[PDB]
Design a protein around this ligand. Sequence first.
Ligand SMILES: CCCCCCCCCCCCCCCCCC(=O)OC[C@H](COP(=O)(O)OCCN)OC(=O)CCCCCCCCCCCCCCCCC
Ligand code: SF4
Ligand code: SF4
Ligand code: SF4
Lengths: 115, 144, 156, 45, 318, 188, 178
Amino acid sequence: MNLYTVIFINILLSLTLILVAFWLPQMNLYSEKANPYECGFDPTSSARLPFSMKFFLVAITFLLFDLEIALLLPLPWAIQTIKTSTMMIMAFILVTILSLGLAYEWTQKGLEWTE
Amino acid sequence: MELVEVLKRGVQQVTGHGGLRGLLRVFFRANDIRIGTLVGEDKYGNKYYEDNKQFFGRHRWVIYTTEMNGKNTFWDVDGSMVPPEWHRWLHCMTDDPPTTNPPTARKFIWTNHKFNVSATPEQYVPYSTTRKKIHEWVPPSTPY
Amino acid sequence: SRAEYVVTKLDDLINWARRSSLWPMTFGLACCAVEMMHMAAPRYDMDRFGVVFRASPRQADVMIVAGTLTNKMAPALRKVYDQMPEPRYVVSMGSCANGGGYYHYSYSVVRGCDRIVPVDIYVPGCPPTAEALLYGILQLQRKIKREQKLKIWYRR
Amino acid sequence: SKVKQDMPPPGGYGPIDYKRNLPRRGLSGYSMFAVGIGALIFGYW
Amino acid sequence: MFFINILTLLVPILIAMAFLTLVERKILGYMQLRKGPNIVGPYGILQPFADAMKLFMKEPMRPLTTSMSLFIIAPTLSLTLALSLWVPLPMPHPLINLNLGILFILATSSLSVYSILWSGWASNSKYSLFGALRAVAQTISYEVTMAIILLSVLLMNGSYSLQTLITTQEHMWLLLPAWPMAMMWFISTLAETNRAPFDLTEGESELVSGFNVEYAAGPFALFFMAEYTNIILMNALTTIIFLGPLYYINLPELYSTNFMMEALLLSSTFLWIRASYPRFRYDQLMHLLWKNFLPLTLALCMWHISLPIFTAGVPPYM
Amino acid sequence: EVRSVFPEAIIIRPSDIFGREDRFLNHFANYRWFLAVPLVSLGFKTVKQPVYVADVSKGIVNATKDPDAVGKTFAFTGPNRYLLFHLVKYIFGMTHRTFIPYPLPLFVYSWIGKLFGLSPFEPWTTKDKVERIHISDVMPTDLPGLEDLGVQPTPLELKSIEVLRRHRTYRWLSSEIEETKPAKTVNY
Amino acid sequence: TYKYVNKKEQESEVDMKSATDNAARILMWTELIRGLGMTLSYLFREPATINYPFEKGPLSPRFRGEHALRRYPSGEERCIACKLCEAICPAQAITIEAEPRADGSRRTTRYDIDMTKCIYCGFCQEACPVDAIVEGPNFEFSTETHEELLYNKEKLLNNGDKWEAEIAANIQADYLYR
Ligand SMILES: CCCCCCCCCCCCCCCCCC(=O)OC[C@H](COP(=O)(O)OCCN)OC(=O)CCCCCCCCCCCCCCCCC
Ligand code: SF4
Ligand code: SF4
Ligand code: SF4
């Protein structure tokens, strides 16, 4: 409950701070100040439109590498086992497999962006 | 060594403005302590110190007054309060202060300088210096 | 002691805050902006006074019209001034912006930013020495120092 | 009197340097790698 | 008394943020041949308070195109996470003794990204969304290396607890065993926190203040102090992990003092780095941190798996 | 008393004025933060003839120039007498939010106005504001008006969007005036 | 004559030593420690800044700032309404309207300068045949109103009676060049 308490304290700090920021100052609202910036001129279209991402393959392989992290992360407990050879070989195999996949992607120009 | 000598120089800086009162009066008010030579005092209170061992923006400086024309410049200081006799020496148009090479006296020159007046009363308001050009006809004060 | 005195000192505090931290905008149009840069530069450092630029007008407390204002660039200026959140101040910098300047009588010039934004302080020059712009900024500080808002609110 | 026009002095001015001078410095690289691997092996021991 | 402990952990960190802003400005000044703030206080020791007060007196911007819920909630989350990250920090005795502190840190930061990434979307505008997508790319870049670096480093500590590193470093630092992992960790802490040269989300000359262009007041201030709090956190992490100070069970305040010294050094190093270099490109960052850092990271992970074994240096589980 | 002490005066009597920063249309529109709008008698038995600001201003500005209008009153009313329920409905259609009205007696709505008037700042609602909202506009048929002074009254259906777009959300901000089914009127 | 800036003379000479040096440039950021050291050197230099209101920038007598209408040592008004300061003013900032003074003297009834049109060029003072209007040293005359920066004869004469002690010296210094 100590940790819950610390987090609630930080939460309430942030919310009290926002309450102050909103209800302490003065307001003069009108449509010409509440509309999006776009550098002095007006936008030509909405921002809720497609933004083509040109690193999507990199995103997906980041997901798979995240899973590889999740598999590598038990090693500090895997080392206090009696075998210490099966874990060695298996971790070697996992890392080498990941490196092989990275190399295939690299050579096939997956780390390059879709111009 | 030299660390001790710079500490001595800082001690002299701390202890060459009178006391704590006189030190804070300069430190909270100009954010500097650097001691120099008093060139001369003005007819309002300004002090116009000098130290040529510094470089060519700080070899000359001012310490303003706390009351120029009933305005309480202890905090609200402005560069319009340097009169022209010292303006020339402070902006480094000369190596010749007015305590040695003073200016010519003239009946029409202002004696008392005036700082910038922009929002106060006794500021400036423009107006046509000219006169009525097209005069009107004043009719008579009788009938028929 | 008195509520009015407490209000006066509180207003002194809020003015001190807004005065010791006024964040101008990266909004410069013409030559006068070069002297604005020179003010930002080492000799006449602005950050010494708590005056650092911010690119967005919403993270800004003041705008300095450092250049010539044209008929094609006036809507943008007004959009930017509008988007700035109040309290906000304007400094017209240079003859081209105080009045029309050297381009007063031309077809594509507005003859002062007075017609588009409300100016608090006028800085003359073509260009104005950054020394002079700095004087004008400290004069704007002095203007903020005497706002007397909560005083008059108490007296409503 | 005679004229005075801010001419240069008698004997020209000194030689102004204009060429680039970025001084090649630093260790060899063999030395740096030796230091690194030595720190590394001592740390492992 | 736990609440007084919360105070002694939270308020000094906020003053530290506030005066780090001053230190940043003044160090960048003197590197730039100028004096930073020396006016508002004696040597400018009140400019942070002035900035805060002035920011909380400005009118906040509630635009029309925005999604107000995410808009208001993102700075809240930002500061909350920046301030909860300081919780398990052993300096030397922590406030909250967790057994998986580094996983808490990792998850908390990967969630801290979502402040940027939802504020940018909620603030319906172009440069805002640019900053958001750049944050996505940045996290894609750095998260893998951060995790595998930290794994390789704790693979000679034996646990994810932060407090065990103090005993792992009772007679030495982990910088001499792992200076390469330390390099890459430093630059990934530099990619995290969105700090130059890896800024790329408030990149004022590429974007016009991304993910804050529509934020004006105390919300923007919250983002600001969240950034400047995460900076000190990451310096504290680097100096707890690699630059292990002296514990001395009778003299724990010595640990706290050396921790202070090293954290200040590394934070001033962040500011130095801001002053010195130009900005990367957010695709060049990917190319760097995939094609240079991840190969060597995996290779050195293999090395640090082998090393406990062929040296008989397997650490203990508590 | 102004007529007594300064005859040869001019007294302009406008109805509820509406403009960008008014306290009338924005006032009705700001009843969305509370989840419903109260209206005495459901808003019926109350009539409103609101005028645009620019018409009032032009009328004043011509009154300071017309040789007539020296000792005369004026009814700056605007056309299209609206009924309060339908006026608020048009507001809440232009501002595309919702419309959950409900009735409320004048005494409790007045008490609400009082406790909202306990405000050191510029309050939101007050007893006198409630009263002034819930008393019909007088028929101006015995006073000159704008047309006798040189101004065509601009109808509210022509200017409402300018002031009420501030309150529209995204999903309804970029929406036109011809999607609001204008208000039913009366003559009475 | 010309010269190449980024043209290698010739390539293809590498041994393990040069490879080690390049691989240590890489992997140690050696050409970045130089930038760090440069910025560190700059941290320990004297900053170029100045406490502005108390110590200021260096100017010369030729500096041209606020205007002024001067007088003779007798106090006589020095302008004569020859009306060419406005002939040459390339901003059309100056107006003059002149009459006889009832002493029988060519003098002005008007001397206005829209200092929001002035470009501070000096043409008026190098065109005046009597050294009447000058461009003085004051650069600290910012205002909170446009109307204050529209001057007339009285304001310019106030400036002259204020700044004569400076302007006389500046003129004494700069003549023999003009
Ligand atoms: C016993 C046998 C086994 C032993 C095994 C160990 C063998 C030795 C291992 C040495 C490896 C050291 C780690 C090197 C990682 C960097 C890899 C690299 O090549 O540099 C990356 C990047 C590339 O630069 P570039 O010129 O473009 O070359 C790339 C061409 N493909 O260049 C960059 O990253 C620069 C961009 C980032 C700039 C950020 C600013 C850095 C400022 C320097 C601060 C240094 C402070 C570090 C202190 C850390 C303390 C925790
Ligand atoms: S006033 Fe002069 S310096 Fe300034 S923008 Fe105009 S022409 Fe350029
Ligand atoms: S040129 Fe000189 S003398 Fe002639 S009108 Fe102008 S100021 Fe007067
Ligand atoms: S300095 Fe040039 S622009 Fe200014 S008034 Fe004189 S002639 Fe005109």
